[PDB]
């Protein structure tokens, strides 16, 4: 790749738009045709190198990529439309999808919305809507799983790119866009990180662009996550992760009392004998502790209305630590710090309101010594004067504490 970069830089020293296009001979016409040919290869590195070389050639010649690629678009497009996409192996499907996605991003009108493109998009949607067992069967083999994940990611990306085109789904009025959003939501709850990231990005982009959401579609999207949060015994980490992702996505949609329900679940799980037995060992890998930590993690994502549970959560954490006999360290410390760092004024005021008690100043001092607690340190630096004033009031009050 380095040698290819050097050669391309050297040969294009004095390029001009006339030499990079066919006659109305040109030096770089054959080179550009050859490079454009390899944009649908089954090897991702080949595609990356081809597109990088094309962009480098275009920049030096002072032109636009679509101008260079307009004459040769057929050579790449024709083969893709000639076969049903549901029969080819995984690698060929992925290459074709990626090539079409890149081609329809140079400019809005580069790829017309003819019958073939619509058929390809429906095929991609159907592929993304399938199941691991259906797609040749998931034998747990590593390579098949990787192929399936990559294919799903490519389908999601092409659908997201098609969403930006107002034409897609508008001229139909049939449930295409609703189905696309439903598939996005279904993919956002998968067990694979790459597809989860792709789905999250596509969904956030769609939500920002649309600016509004039908009530029924969002009700359907939000029903599955709230379905599993009606039983403490059935609470699992994955459901809490999905809820956190949704909260990060739809900021001003959810409501209060979910935190109270989660705290009730926590109290249910934290059996006294269970904790007494969990002590005397390394419980950081126990499932129940992981569930409790996951529950704690959500509080720092809720809207401002969650500010009223600070005392409750602090009391719960301190009592749990007392039960387990831990100090300076526990699985619940990190999310608690993350949450408490969002309300520096409130936490400062609450802590200074109970300066007499020794159990809270110690906790605040422990919190402030963490590397990631910077906003609290800034607020403390700002209000050192008030802190000293209140402490002077306490000392001059004339007590034994």
């Amino acid at each position: 790749q380095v040698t290819l970069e050097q050669l391309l830089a050297r040969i294009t020293r004095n390029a001009k738009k006339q030499d990079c296009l066919p006659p109305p001979p040109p030096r770089l016409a054959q080179l550009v045709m050859m490079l454009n040919s390899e944009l649908a290869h089954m090897n991702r590195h080949v595609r990356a190198t081809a597109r990088r070389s094309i962009e480098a050639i275009a920049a030096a010649a002072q032109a636009e990529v679509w101008e260079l690629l307009e004459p040769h678009k057929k050579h790449i497009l024709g083969p893709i439309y000639a076969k049903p996409l549901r029969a080819l192996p995984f690698a060929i499907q992925i290459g074709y999808i990626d090539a079409v996605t890149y081609y329809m991003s140079l400019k809005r009108d580069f790829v017309p919305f003819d019958e073939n493109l619509n058929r390809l998009l429906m095929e991609s949607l159907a592929l993304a809507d399938a199941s691991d067992e259906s797609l040749a069967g998931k034998t747990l083999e590593f390579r098949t799983h990787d192929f399936i994940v990559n294919l799903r990611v490519s389908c999601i990306k092409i659908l997201s790119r098609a969403m930006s085109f107002e034409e897609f789904g508008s001229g139909s009025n049939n449930p295409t866009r609703p189905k696309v959003v439903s598939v996005f939501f279904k993919c956002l709850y998968s067990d694979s990180q790459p597809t989860i990231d792709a789905a999250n990005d596509a969904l956030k982009a769609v939500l920002q662009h649309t600016t509004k959401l039908p009530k029924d579609l969002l009700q359907s999207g939000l029903r599955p996550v709230l379905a599993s949060l009606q039983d403490a015994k059935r609470l699992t980490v994955h459901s809490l992760d999905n809820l956190g992702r949704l909260l990060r996505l739809l900021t001003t949609y959810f409501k209060v009392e979910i935190g109270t329900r989660l705290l009730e679940h926590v109290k249910q799980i934290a059996d006294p004998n269970f904790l007494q037995q969990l002590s005397f060992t390394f419980f950081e890998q126990n499932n129940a502790m992981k569930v409790i930590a996951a529950v704690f993690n959500i509080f720092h994502l809720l809207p401002d209305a969650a500010r009223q549970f600070k005392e409750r959560v602090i009391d719960n954490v301190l009592d749990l630590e007392q039960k387990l006999r831990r100090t300076h360290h526990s699985p619940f410390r990190l999310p608690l710090y993350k949450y408490l760092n969002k309300y520096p004024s409130d936490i400062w005021a609450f802590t200074l309101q109970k300066l007499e008690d020794l159990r809270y100043g110690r906790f605040l001092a422990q919190v402030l010594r963490h590397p990631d607690s910077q906003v609290l340190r800034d607020y403390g630096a700002a209000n050192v004067e008030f802190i000293i004033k209140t402490c002077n009031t306490v000392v001059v009050s004339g007590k034994e504490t």
Binding site: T281, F282, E284, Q285
Partner: protein, 69 residues
């Protein structure tokens, strides 16, 4: 290095310390191929100690090593 080895060989403290050591080493795993003999040799020796400790107490340490395998 004789301190971790002594801790792991002992029956009483082997499980918890093995778990802590594995949880710590799985973050630096990326430094095992750093091409600096001094840095990589220590990591390799620590991994060897952890696996030997797993071997010694089969029925107690297997559950600790199961997640990272």
């Amino acid at each position: 290095l004789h301190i971790p080895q002594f801790f792991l060989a002992s029956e009483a403290t082997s499980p918890s310390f093995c778990g802590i050591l594995l949880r710590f080493l799985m973050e630096r795993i990326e430094d095992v191929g750093s091409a600096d003999i001094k840095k990589s040799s220590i990591l390799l020796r620590l991994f060897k100690l952890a696996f030997m400790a797993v071997t010694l107490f089969a029925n107690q340490n297997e559950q600790v090593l199961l997640p990272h395998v």
